[PDB]
């Protein structure tokens, strides 16, 4: 229980908190012991000071001993700047601090502002102090984007109006998510996306076809997911791994095409029924205004992974009529603790057979 005050480094990880609900209070320090001695009273008047009362880089709050001799009861307001890891956006949150005194033969657990003057409890001088710091309920709602937010909080630990013992460095990481907004976004299509292969005839009974669909993958998390899983599936069970498009009337009268996908800078060739598991470390990200999946269509800018799906179809010995097939894209961004229900998007595909 004896403890001598000096510099310390700590880390603290909050969340994942989903925006779905108002944020709980999170503890950063709960009556953490900063100094205590059984015999002497050197730690009678512990105080804690911010490096600056104006600069919020490492937390802003009083940075001098309170000049009054009467205590300042209650909590201190610390303004601290958080930085979002992938987008580098900055936003300040409030953190709350206070200290409490320990006395060997009495109890005066009253909360004092961090820079407060000391007091005695039934004429006994304190023998140490504890520190608490928490984030008040609902502060997280003020962060403007989903993702990983970092701050580095710094407090000076000192004997009031006396020697400074050291500095406390607390690295706080907030993980903020919006899972109800995980989605595969089609810039070009409001509710359902359908495209034609644009069939062209050349060089004899042979035919061409090529079109593409643009899309974003959003992980609710400003692309802080470590990897992601994508699949393209069409309901024609076969281990052929191919993509068929059938005529609207008769079964097994079908022509085939392939998919290639440019994903955030990476070339891929998905085959039917085979998930891809892509590491996100190398992918690029773009800002895009997406529509909110769950509430109304209004669109809010997020940081997502751009993609372009290309369809290529060449077939000889196609039959007269008209073709259609559907592509089912499913998407599951990696998860720190629990899985994210796979999201999905369907694309309808059309083909034209041209009799003279």
UniProtKB/Swiss-Prot annotation:
It holds the Pfam family CblD. Its main location: other. It is found in: Fimbrium. The keyword Thylakoid does not apply. Keywords: Fimbrium, Plasmid. GO terms for cellular component: pilus. The keyword Phosphoprotein does not apply. This is CFA/I fimbrial subunit E. The gene is cfaE.
């Amino acid at each position: 229980a004896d403890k001598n005050p000096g510099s310390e480094n700590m880390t603290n990880t909050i969340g994942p908190h989903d925006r779905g609900g108002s944020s709980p209070i999170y503890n950063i320090l709960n009556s953490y012991l900063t100094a205590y001695n059984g015999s002497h009273h050197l730690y009678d008047r512990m105080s804690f000071l911010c490096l600056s009362s104006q600069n919020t880089l490492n937390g802003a709050c009083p940075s001098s001993d309170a000049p009054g001799t009467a205590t300042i009861d209650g909590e201190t307001n610390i303004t601290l700047q958080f930085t979002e890891k992938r987008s580098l956006i900055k936003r300040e949150l409030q953190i709350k601090g206070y200290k409490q005194f320990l006395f060997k033969n009495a109890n005066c657990p009253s909360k004092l502002a961090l820079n407060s003057s000391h007091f005695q409890c039934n004429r006994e001088q304190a023998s140490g102090a504890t520190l608490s710091l928490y984030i008040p309920a609902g502060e997280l709602n003020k962060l403007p984007f989903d993702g990983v937010w970092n701050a580095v909080l710094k407090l000076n630990v000192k004997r009031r109006y006396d020697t400074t013992y050291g500095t406390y460095t607390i690295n706080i990481t907030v993980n903020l998510t919006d899972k109800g907004n995980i989605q595969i976004w089609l810039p070009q299509f409001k509710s359902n996306a359908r495209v034609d292969l644009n069939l062209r005839p050349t060089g004899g009974g042979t035919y061409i076809g090529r079109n593409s669909v643009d899309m974003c993958f959003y992980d609710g998390y400003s692309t802080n997911s470590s990897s992601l899983e994508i699949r393209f599936q069409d309901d024609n069970s076969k281990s052929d791994g191919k993509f068929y498009l059938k005529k609207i009337n008769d079964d097994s009268k079908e022509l085939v095409y392939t998919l290639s996908l440019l994903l955030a800078g990476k070339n891929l060739t998905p085959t039917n029924g085979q998930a891809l598991n892509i590491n996100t470390a190398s992918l690029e990200t773009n800002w895009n205004r997406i529509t909110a999946v769950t509430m109304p269509e209004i669109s809010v800018p997020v940081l997502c992974w751009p993609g372009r799906l290309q369809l290529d179809a060449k077939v000889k010995n196609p039959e007269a009529g008209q073709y259609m097939g559907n592509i089912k894209i499913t998407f599951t961004p990696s998860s720190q603790t629990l899985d994210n229900k796979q999201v999905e998007k369907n694309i309808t595909v059309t083909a034209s057979v041209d009799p003279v």
